[PDB]
């Protein structure tokens, strides 16, 4: 149901890429493949298994996981989020097809990844 070299699963197209890029490039690269393609995203374990079926960690669709957080001081100090710019490490999520455990690591890291989309 999908293009050449890609793989199909539940109306969705996947494809591992043995190319070393940082999260943002991996993500962008995916989007430049097909209209509607992103870094793989797991909405259930099953979906993960199929991706495993396709170093040690691959980029998945989770970006800037810390700066998208809410912050609070232990003494309830009041602050203006506008002042908290890039305050936390810029980190992204990489998967380990083996144990299937996700690692939150620096987005600048170079990891192989998997793209995904729907026809």
């Amino acid at each position: 149901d999908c293009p050449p070299d890609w793989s199909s699963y539940e109306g969705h197209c996947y494809r591992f890429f043995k190319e070393w890029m940082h999260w943002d490039d991996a993500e962008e690269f995916c989007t430049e493949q097909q209209t509607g393609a992103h870094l793989v995203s797991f909405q259930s374990k099953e979906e993960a298994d199929f991706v495993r079926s396709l170093g040690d960690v691959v980029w998945i669709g989770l970006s800037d996981v810390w700066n998208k957080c809410r912050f609070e001081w232990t003494d309830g100090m009041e602050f203006d989020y506008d002042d908290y710019y890039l305050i936390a490490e810029y980190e992204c999520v990489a998967s380990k097809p083996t144990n299937n455990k996700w690692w939150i690591i620096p987005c600048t890291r170079f990891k192989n990844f998997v793209c995904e989309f729907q026809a």
């Binding site: 998208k68 305050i87 980190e91 939150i104």
Partner: protein, 133 residues
Amino acid sequence: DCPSGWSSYEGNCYKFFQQKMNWADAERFCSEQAKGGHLVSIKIYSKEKDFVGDLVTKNIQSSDLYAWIGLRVENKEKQCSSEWSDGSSVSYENVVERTVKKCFALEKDLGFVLWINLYCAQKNPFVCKSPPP
């Protein structure tokens, strides 16, 4: 006006402790040092920044690289990304705990003035802050 070993600034008392503890034990420890005591809170764009900065530099009687402060990620989740890069909301998660960095600390370089989020279970020295008794 502040107690023994504590420094004072804009109305409060500050103290650097070398004892290395995880973020949560450091927070509890500071609350027992005084009524209204907590891991130091810092107004990002202020002079309290350099005060606390100097306090830790000329006291960090160790080569430690971090000093816990009272700021912490507030979300209960292990990572605060609501949706994936596609758009799908996040619900199924499988994040490795030892990888979550929700507790903040002062960084050594530039003199403990820059913040950095770390893995809370980590043990670091800290700065306490309580209002004058």
